[PDB]
């Protein structure tokens, strides 16, 4: 039987590319999404057309709240319901926007979104994933190669991504006796924000030492595929930068 | 005029020793507390005996919630109302307990407490601190030297402390133009929990290369004193381990 | 045309596994050795049995000296001579023994810092100077911040190797040369080490309470040289079964 | 009796500031120097004029060679000979210049100077200091806050500074049982090279978030003074950045 993977925030961009590659490697996939319903169902069709009964969608808001644990349990439950198993969790979904320290969402909303999506939901998902467990079980967290050289005024985002590092490490340690690996992949600049002006994009591109270009979504996914594969069986608690040297560049 | 400091969770143990030494150095202090009113009041009385009108207490729950921002703004305001100013914020209060990933606080409460005290309250206190602003303004976050070799099954605690490194860095960068420096002190093993058997304390003590003992609260306070002093005026984004070499010791 | 790879210290143990896998992936390989001539040649014989003229051996002391630069230049020339090209350099060779703070100490400097950092720097200079999917992989150490007691110089060499990884990644990026690392925790334990001291280390490893095989270290190396890692440079991948996460 | 300190490369710039400050704190100091004999005795004269018999010079090349161990052993011997003890060792001397990987001195000589001054000499001096020994013994290594975002084409220097981090850690661990603490101080930009053009100094200055200026040599020396002081007696294996936030600024 074919193994199954959950990918959060998988309707578009990097998450989609991870879902597509996992699928091409032989996985059945839960394509989680929040707002991008059309793109998610569209991807599940593309996939199932290629191999029938291999992709389902699963809608969930991953903002922090008192129901997030239930929501996360349900994303995992959904994989077992469609496919009878859950081998791989990829925590990819993430909110990303500035939260300046000094002065239209309230600040409690900003905490819930940025820390929910980037850290707490991954914790809750990781918890449900393990509670529900030949086998090659692993988790891959989408981290950030620039965590120690952060975007200006992005303190909540950055705090989320730092937490995700801590979770990668704590979970690898605690879950290792159960044969579940936990690793990360840390893009530098990859697919840039849709809302970002083209001048800002180029300004980021020209900083990258390897090819003066952002990573493709496919390049991020390749690292993911490696970490879940048989060639990474002794790897746990590792975070692989996939940043073309960007974090190596001084101010 | 004497500068003023806020110390969170200042009733006991490390934060008390921090508030004491700060006061000894000529700071006026807001002693924040959650449940330990009697120790907090007793500390304020001892301090006011040394110098009249130099200590006040301030009670608040720092658990994450919709009211946390106002609570943190109110703690900063309390310093200004007492002393006319606020030069130093020390984020010391912290919840600490296991949150195993597998197998009666609900998990959303644990999240709120662990991530609220260790990370989100610090962020909101930082916001309110900066919003309200010779002078030497700084923030010191109480971090954790073992954050990359975490305690088994303390994943939410650990996630909190990592998020705290993130804030320390992100805030140093963003607040440096206001002349606010932001740093950390990272104990390894300091004062062990009150109930802990001495035999269990000895397992940790024995691990410490420098003296086979835990740091006193006073030794942790010394590093805070240094970070706030005129001797550290170019230091921001720095986290000083005060750990006796514990973090260098392999398994 | 098949790409070619230099592997230093490739007669035995992890270097041999890296060479074999590179060969199984389709590389032609230079098997560098210092004392292990017999083992180096039997590897090459075995590899050339699978495919003729795809494995050569290359001898050199990698101890720091006045002659090390030439020696390192020659290891690279030996790949160009055998195969017309050099696509991959694996810095694996390494001296490893204690140097307590309280052989002459100057010889320990020369071996431990020469093998672990200086020779890698010189091999990197020569690789780049003679210059598709080009990369260098350095064998680092996952325990480099929780070092073994009384192993200063080794630890200094492995920290230096981290710095070279980073500096060379940054500086060779414009030539399309990627520079990465693989950091074993505990893999094949030293031959001398007592079986009881071996079991103490095995017990510490969270993922399976066993060391990494050489093949597991090599898989990471294979990934790093592959078209699947074309945006990765200045990365060091730990392959340590979580050992580095385990507090004292 | 007053304690004694050895400061390598102490004739000028940061080394001088450390020796001066250590002197004002009440230390007797060995002023090690290499080529700067005039500045070195001139400093020793000044300091001896404040307190007679409290400063001596000591000439040594710290380039790696087969006699380097003897040279480093004799530096320590020179402190015991002048003062009857050696409490503090500051490893400040450093060669600093580019060594491009792709194309003056031979490369053997570049290795010996850059790795010698920055790593090997400090290791040997550490062996010698330890071998000679309520007091307060410590070593302070002058590191580099930018080691993970290094200067382009400075690989050997950068390798030297990484090695010095490894020494700081390995030595703190191995020497702790002897009550010898080993720490570091890591400038980002402090005094710029004398040969640097002012236009180019300002480029680096503008990168610093905290004041858009370089650290004064006194500001570096302050962190050294803290680490050797009784306020740091539980600190070992710690490297304190003094970089004004420079290391946190992305490309
Ligand atoms: N792009 C980069 O350069 C870069 C750099 C460093 C790290 N990363 C990391 O790499 C990963 C992928 O990056 P990306 O740019 O592809 O991500 P992205 O497009 O910004 O976000 C991916 C998805 O996250 C989901 N999401 C946002 N808020 C959510 C919420 N409250 N609940 C549930 N899902 C939510 C969205 O789903 P819907 O569209 O379905 O609403 C979105 O499509 C992220 O974790 C990111 O932090 C990316
Ligand atoms: N002790 C160590 O070995 C060690 C090691 C690494 C890091 N640290 C860090 O150093 C700092 C001080 O350590 P410690 O051992 O002295 O801390 P602690 O005694 O465990 O806790 C300090 C105070 O935190 C306050 N607190 C807990 N939950 C709270 C909440 N929901 N709202 C508001 N306040 C709350 C409590 O105040 P009340 O008593 O008023 O309720 C408590 O007295 C902490 O940040 C800790 O993480 C300590
Ligand atoms: N095994 C582990 O647990 C572990 C852990 C962390 C890192 N690593 C790293 O992974 C790599 C391989 O590990 P290993 O255990 O396979 O290495 P190893 O067996 O200790 O040494 C590998 C080879 O290095 C060569 N070498 C030693 N001194 C030399 C010199 N002066 N000049 C030239 N070559 C020399 C030797 O070649 P000859 O036999 O031909 O003389 C030896 O066979 C090393 O870089 C090591 O530091 C290993
Ligand atoms: N300046 C900065 O921005 C900065 C940045 C990062 C780290 N640091 C660290 O802070 C420390 C002091 O910096 P600095 O700029 O003041 O240093 P510096 O002026 O470059 O050098 C200090 C002294 O090092 C000695 N030295 C050089 N080569 C030597 C050799 N072969 N043998 C013996 N001694 C030798 C020289 O002594 P003589 O003059 O007597 O020949 C020199 O005056 C250094 O370790 C440096 O790497 C500085
Ligand atoms: C700043 O710290 C930073 C630098 C480069 C790239 C990022 C980044 N993180 C992201 N997360 C999410 N969810 N989505 C996007 N688009 C990004 C980006 C970008 N660009 C942050
Ligand atoms: C495990 O990660 C760990 C090791 C050593 C010391 C600690 C530690 N963190 C704490 N935070 C708080 N708020 N209170 C206490 N007592 C502690 C301790 C301890 N001991 C954690
Ligand atoms: C101590 O720092 C340390 C812990 C685990 C494993 C190693 C290690 N480094 C090595 N280098 C070389 N060249 N050869 C071997 N065998 C090893 C080992 C081991 N085991 C060091
Ligand atoms: C590059 O890696 C880098 C950035 C900032 C400052 C330095 C630096 N290192 C030095 N070492 C020595 N011995 N002397 C000086 N002047 C410097 C400087 C500077 N500036 C390197």
Quick structural summary:
By secondary structure, chain A is α/β, with parallel strands linked by helices. Helices cover 43% and strands 15% of the residues of chain A.
Question: What does this entry look like structurally?
Answer:
Chain C: Substrate binds at residue 135. Chain C: The active site is at 141 (proton donor/acceptor), 154 (proton donor/acceptor), 154 (proton acceptor). Chain C: This is Pteridine reductase. Chain C: Belongs to the short-chain dehydrogenases/reductases (SDR) family. Chain C: It holds the Pfam family adh_short_C2. The structure is a homotetramer. Chain A contains seven helices and seven strands. Chain A is α/β, with parallel strands linked by helices. Chain A has a single domain (1-251), classed as NAD(P)-binding Rossmann-like Domain (Rossmann fold, 3-Layer(aba) Sandwich), CATH 3.40.50. A seven-stranded parallel beta sheet of chain A has the order 3-2-1-4-5-6-7, sandwiched between helices. In chain A, strand 5, helix 5 and strand 6 form a beta-alpha-beta unit. The termini of chain A are far apart. Chains in contact: A-B, A-C, A-D, B-C, B-D, C-D. The interface between A and B is large, with 46 and 46 residues.
């Amino acid at each position: 039987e074919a193994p199954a993977a959950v990918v959060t925030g998988a309707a578009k961009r990097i998450g989609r590319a991870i879902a597509v590659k996992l699928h091409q490697t032989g996985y059945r996939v839960v394509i989680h999404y929040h707002n991008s319903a059309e793109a998610a169902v569209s991807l599940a069709d593309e996939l199932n057309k290629e191999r029938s009964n291999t992709a389902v969608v699963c809608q969930a808001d991953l903002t922090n709240s008192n129901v997030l644990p239930a929501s996360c349990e349900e994303i995992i439950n959904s994989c077992f319901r469609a496919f009878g198993r859950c081998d791989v969790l990829v925590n990819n979904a993430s909110a990303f926007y500035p939260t300046p320290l000094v002065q239209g969402k309230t600040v409690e909303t900003q905490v819930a979104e940025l820390i929910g999506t980037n850290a707490i939901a991954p914790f809750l998902l990781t918890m449900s994933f393990a509670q529900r467990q030949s086998s090659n079980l692993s988790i891959v967290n989408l981290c950030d190669a620039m965590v120690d050289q952060p975007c200006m005024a992005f303190s909540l985002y950055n705090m989320g991504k730092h937490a995700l590092v801590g979770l990668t490490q704590s979970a690898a340690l605690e879950l290792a006796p159960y044969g579940i690996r936990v690793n990360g992949v840390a893009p530098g600049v990859s697919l840039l924000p849709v809302a970002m002006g083209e001048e800002e994009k180029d300004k980021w591109r020209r900083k990258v030492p390897l090819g003066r270009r952002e990573a493709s979504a496919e390049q991020i996914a390749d690292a993911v595929i490696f970490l879940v594969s048989g060639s990474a069986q002794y790897i746990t608690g590792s975070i692989i930068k996939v940043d073309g040297g960007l974090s190596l560049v001084h101010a």
